[PDB]
Amino acid sequence: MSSLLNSLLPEYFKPKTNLNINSSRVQYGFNARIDMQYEDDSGTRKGSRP
Amino acid sequence: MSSLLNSLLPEYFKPKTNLNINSSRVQYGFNARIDMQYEDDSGTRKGSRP
User: Fold this and answer.
1) How many A-B residue pairs are in contact by the CB < 8 A criterion?
2) Cβ atoms of B14 and B30 closer than 8 Å
3) Which listed site, A8, A21, A35, B44, has its alpha carbon 20 to 30 Å from B38?
4) Residue contact B46–A43, C-beta within 8 A
5) 3-state class of A34 per DSSP?
């Protein structure tokens, strides 16, 4: 059933037809922007991985 | 004039009669609590001298 397996894919994922696989290992994932924060009695230390 | 020289003294200063001076040098002043702060894009670093 193509229909039920299609709904499992994420909303942001827009797939194309061809995929040129040339190896026996693939790292599928996503890139996200994490805005980390460390608060303490002394003060706050902010970080950001884009 | 005792009156005009009396008004120059601070409000918190409550003087007593006797002062036992035993040297040719005196460091008059006051003790205060300073709450310092350093803010930056990275974060805030707070200090306190009681």
Assistant:
1) 16
2) no
3) A35
4) yes
5) strand
